[PDB]
Amino acid sequence: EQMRLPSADVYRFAEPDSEENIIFEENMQPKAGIPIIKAGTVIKLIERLTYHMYADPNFVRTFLTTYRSFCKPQELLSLIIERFEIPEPEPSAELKRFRKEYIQPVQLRVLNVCRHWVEHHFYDFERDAYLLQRMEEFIGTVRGKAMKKWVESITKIIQRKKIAITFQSSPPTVEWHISRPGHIETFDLLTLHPIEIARQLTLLESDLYRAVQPSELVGSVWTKEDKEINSPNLLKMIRHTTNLTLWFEKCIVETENLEERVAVVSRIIEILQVFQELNNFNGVLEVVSAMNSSPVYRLDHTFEQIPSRQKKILEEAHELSEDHYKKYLAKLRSINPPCVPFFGIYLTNILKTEEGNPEVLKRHGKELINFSKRRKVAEITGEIQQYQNQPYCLRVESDIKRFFENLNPMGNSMEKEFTDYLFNKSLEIEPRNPKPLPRFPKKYSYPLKSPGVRPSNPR
């Protein structure tokens, strides 16, 4: 026995499924045994988002993360209210069945959608107070004792949302080299302890990685004209990375004495080694980028004096980027949190996913929303989030932290001006063949020897 809903003329979600309104991929939702929706009309997507036969957490997350390309927030809310408001078919028995097995489950599922929406995508409501107005009045409308619990829970969440780290066991001892605690004026690449440089950059960069939300990524919004409005945390993260790469380049090419410059490069490689121990891949690549930069890469006299062990360290790290990040990708899949991924790959994959697939598919002349495209985007944003939950077991040092936050190697210069200055500086310190190599005087009045990359004290 089937179930007999009302006519589609009075309730749009009663329309039956057909090749013209909903289509599926050939395989089954993993863990769950549910079909994977490929495409559908918004009516059908909403039917299935609140389907009476079973719950679909996967589809709910995916939908709520990606819907805005094809459905405005206000539209979505109107649709779930319409979905909720189920009339009975016209002339007990099937009736009781219809309330218990169609109306009640659907109403619950709508409530579940509201709860997830408000819990995980509250930004829709911060940005549109009228949307929140409508959600509050809808919720206050809702009738049953079956519903009371979910309604109260939604209301509590809304209130929490309107409102404006310490470790598992001991973090390691903070490391100091030449600069002493408090003496922020002495801090520089060679005077801080390389271990601690890498630790404190990793902390900064972890927090930066963790602040980026899917709302800054879905729809490729970081590439559009409103990028500063829509992707502020992503952009701060990238700017920090760029800033550090540039600071490394600068440290290198402004150290004119060959021997001192070798110490500088060697120290950077040591910091890279620690990033690597910490699985800070963003840190790793900010060093690799610097070393591959046109002002640094050409410094053959400097490279020649780098102890071979550290040559090998740098060369291995460069290799992570080769062949479209083949080794980086494998290494990342194989490690466990905490880490700091390199974000660039995600950005390219999201953009290419959105650009390389149609927004709609057509079937028997009917337009269907291409949901599989959105699913792929949500898989990428889901991979980003998996590396965001676990913090590092490292103590912040607030002076070293401030030193790296306020780093500004470019100064008041524009990009072009600055990178030309770096390149010209490179040419000055190691001229092109056949020009002979000049000598330059030492600029550092403290010792150049590294304290190495092993902790100075136990446990």
Binding site: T242, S289, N292, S294, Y297, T348, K352, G356, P358, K376
Partner: protein, 168 residues
């Protein structure tokens, strides 16, 4: 079998993506998963010589401005791409060419200029203007349409020809 490492450079909001996606995908599927290896490698026949294109498109990473040298160093040939409806992306080309020349440490790097048409707003860079620029650099100019696949093969194949001429 010879393999050409191509690199696409250009400003954001230019459809660089589409240019490479349209090369690689089947002439009659609009589908693409950029996560697998076949995403960026295509076997093709050019002037009756079978070869392998490996294409690097870092579209979306434009803000990592300090990684450009690294990405550029990987290429033997370059497509410098602008959008025909964005004058600024056209004016930026000079800078990309200068940077490529510096990265490869060479005055003569295999290179093609590509102007891409997607959808509105309307054209602001006449093809004459781009022909003139391409000519001042001594490189080919190809105009392409994202959506109709017009010019796309021509753009890549021309670059491959430029590499062959350079190597001989």
């Amino acid at each position: 079998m010879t393999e050409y490492k191509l690199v696409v450079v250009g400003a954001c909001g230019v459809g660089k993506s589409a240019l490479t996606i349209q090369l690689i995908q089947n002439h009659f599927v609009d589908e693409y998963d950029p996560t697998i290896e076949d995403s960026y490698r295509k076997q093709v026949v050019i002037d009756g010589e079978t070869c392998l294109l490996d294409i690097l498109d870092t579209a979306g990473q434009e803000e990592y401005s300090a990684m450009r040298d690294q990405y550029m160093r990987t290429g033997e040939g370059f497509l410098c791409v602008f959008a025909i409806n964005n004058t600024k992306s056209f004016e930026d080309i000079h800078h990309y060419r200068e940077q490529i020349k510096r990265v490869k440490d060479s005055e003569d790097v295999p290179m093609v200029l590509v102007g891409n048409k997607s959808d509105l707003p309307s054209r602001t860079v006449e093809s004459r203007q781009a022909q003139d620029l391409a000519r001042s650099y001594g490189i080919p100019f190809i105009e392409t349409s994202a959506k109709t696949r017009q010019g796309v093969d021509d753009a890549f194949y021309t670059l491959v020809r430029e590499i062959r001429k350079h190597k001989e």
